[PDB]
Amino acid sequence: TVVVTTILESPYVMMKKNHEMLEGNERYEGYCVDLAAEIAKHCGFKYKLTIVGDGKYGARDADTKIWNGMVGELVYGKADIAIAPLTITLVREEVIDFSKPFMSLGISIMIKKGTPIESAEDLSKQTEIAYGTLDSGSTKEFFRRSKIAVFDKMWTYMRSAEPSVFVRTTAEGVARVRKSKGKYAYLLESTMNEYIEQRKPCDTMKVGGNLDSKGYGIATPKGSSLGNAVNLAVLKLNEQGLLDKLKNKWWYDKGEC
Ligand SMILES: N[C@@H](Cn1ccc(=O)n(Cc2ccc(C(=O)O)cc2)c1=O)C(=O)O
């Protein structure tokens, strides 16, 4: 009975509208939920979906150097596999094993629908409409490290803009976009942006192309006997369309706009 650690992040895994009535594994739903079923189907095992203990994805702690979130749960033997939007980064591929990407993304732009800007280039030149990123994360560092013209030029601005274009939480940013009446563009991972654009208050939208390329993968403990099977499962699901099928499912069918 494989112990699956995952996490609450819409539309990857969510609590059923009447979850308090359903029990066990049926209490949940979302892209990753469906995906877990396919993995397990194609792999031939029984599983128990468990929401990650401390609610984090996974990072080494500032002092302890010890892994937290799902990564940690995987490194220290608490769970057997992680099925969630876990971006495949070096730091993690050094301690746990990733399947091939099951979905992809990149830093994109979120503008309040109807906004003049349409690309990063369109922003870089601009000075009228402000814009920023989360205060700390993939996105924030990508720019303070990016040696590309269009991006270096952008870092400088956000770098010391006042008020600060940065935001403490990920929803807080989206909030500024809307309430800023158009004087604010947010840069966030393409997946979140897409979701939000299909949500109520349909007043935002993703614009331009992704400024980079990443991808989410399924994680298993180093030495796991599920490793090889899982990776092959992700490949087959992609080869039969099931993934796109799903991404389209939770972002559009379930979309509200
Ligand atoms: N990929 C992450 C996990 N994950 C998955 C889906 C999602 O919507 N978010 C939310 C999120 C997206 C972009 C930013 C940003 O950079 O402004 C901040 C928060 C998330 O953090 C993992 O690899 O750690």
Pocket of ligand 1 (CB under 6 A): 9, 57, 85-87, 133-134, 137-139, 170, 188-189, 191-192
Query: DSSP string of 228-239?
Result: HHHHHHHHHHHH
Q: Is 115 a known ligand-binding residue?
A: no
How many other CB atoms are there within 10 angstroms of residue 89's CB atom? 14
To one decimal, the resolution in angstroms is 2.8
Is 95 in contact with 101 (CB distance < 8 Å)?
no
Domains by residue range for the chain, with CATH: 1-105+215-254 (3.40.190.10), 106-214 (3.40.190.10)
Experimental method: X-ray
Q: Which ligand 1 atom is nearest residue 88's CA? A: 23
Compute the chain's Rg from CA coordinates.
Answer: 19
* Residue 10 to residue 192: CA distance in whole angstroms: 9
Whats the size of the chain, residue-wise?
257
